[PDB]
Write a protein that binds this ligand. Sequence first.
Ligand SMILES: Cc1nc(-c2nc3cc(Cl)ccc3[nH]2)c(C)c(-c2ccccc2)c1[C@H](OC(C)(C)C)C(=O)O
Ligand SMILES: Cc1nc(-c2nc3cc(Cl)ccc3[nH]2)c(C)c(-c2ccccc2)c1[C@H](OC(C)(C)C)C(=O)O
Lengths: 141, 141
Amino acid sequence: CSPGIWQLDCTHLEGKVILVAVHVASGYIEAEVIPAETGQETAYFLLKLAGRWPVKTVHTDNGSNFTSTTVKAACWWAGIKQEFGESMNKELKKIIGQVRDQAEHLKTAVQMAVFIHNKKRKGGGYSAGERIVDIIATDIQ
Amino acid sequence: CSPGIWQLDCTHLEGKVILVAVHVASGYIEAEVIPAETGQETAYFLLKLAGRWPVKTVHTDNGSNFTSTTVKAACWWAGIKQEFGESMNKELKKIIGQVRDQAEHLKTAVQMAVFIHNKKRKGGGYSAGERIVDIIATDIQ
Ligand SMILES: Cc1nc(-c2nc3cc(Cl)ccc3[nH]2)c(C)c(-c2ccccc2)c1[C@H](OC(C)(C)C)C(=O)O
Ligand SMILES: Cc1nc(-c2nc3cc(Cl)ccc3[nH]2)c(C)c(-c2ccccc2)c1[C@H](OC(C)(C)C)C(=O)O
């Protein structure tokens, strides 16, 4: 599938909000514990994302997430469009579960789990980390 | 130069602290406005970094930055080593200066400037964004 498609959603765990972005074509993840599930947090996260990867369109499973003028301003500025028409959210949460006692804060456990997931070779042998980079460079060259 | 070398430092602007990571070989940047210049912030940032890129060693211009047990725990966990033996900090700040009135918060202006810098083609024609991805994939293949 297309190299500029991302999925963005918020799970909850321990009374906190985890924003999770998946690079659809590769399965690569960025996630962030956010204080509140708001347009401002989402806008900000999108700007961070877009400055790091070529982000053409973003899908979500909660469309209402994308209605705030704040979010609209961020996709306007970065040049992003919504997607209208895995779950890595289960798996990520499987991994957080495993590493939870290795860290005091949920946020640290999240980043441990992002790390584990992104490196883990899918022997059949690339990792998600290796695939996104290969796909985006592939698509340069 | 080696594809797993990163530089990490904190500039100040408007009474706030900006953590800036540079991928040395490419000139690609990740930056983040942090509330305080502490070991905890640095540790956390390093975990985020390492889960996204293959991070072998990290250089800094303030070695004392890396002495806290907190920071040590993060490079231990992610498998990172210090570097002992551009400035993109001028340039980044040039760009923040330019975009400042486009955003209410310093943090947004930072992310705008990271975006601008990472995409900007160095016509001679790749961007920093294109080079890191090419270098890391290059180094896979
Ligand atoms: C709060 C916190 N405190 C300490 C910690 N620092 C210490 C310093 C001393 Cl002197 C003794 C015990 C100590 N424990 C550590 C070592 C970590 C840490 C855990 C795993 C990997 C890297 C660092 C965290 C961590 O939070 C971040 C720093 C990443 C924000 C967490 O959520 O567990
Ligand atoms: C605080 C804030 N508020 C609003 C904003 N939202 C609005 C909603 C309405 Cl209804 C009217 C005016 C509005 N202005 C916007 C549109 C932005 C924004 C600026 C540039 C690109 C994307 C979003 C920010 C922004 O901060 C983040 C959201 C990115 C954390 C900033 O620092 O300027």
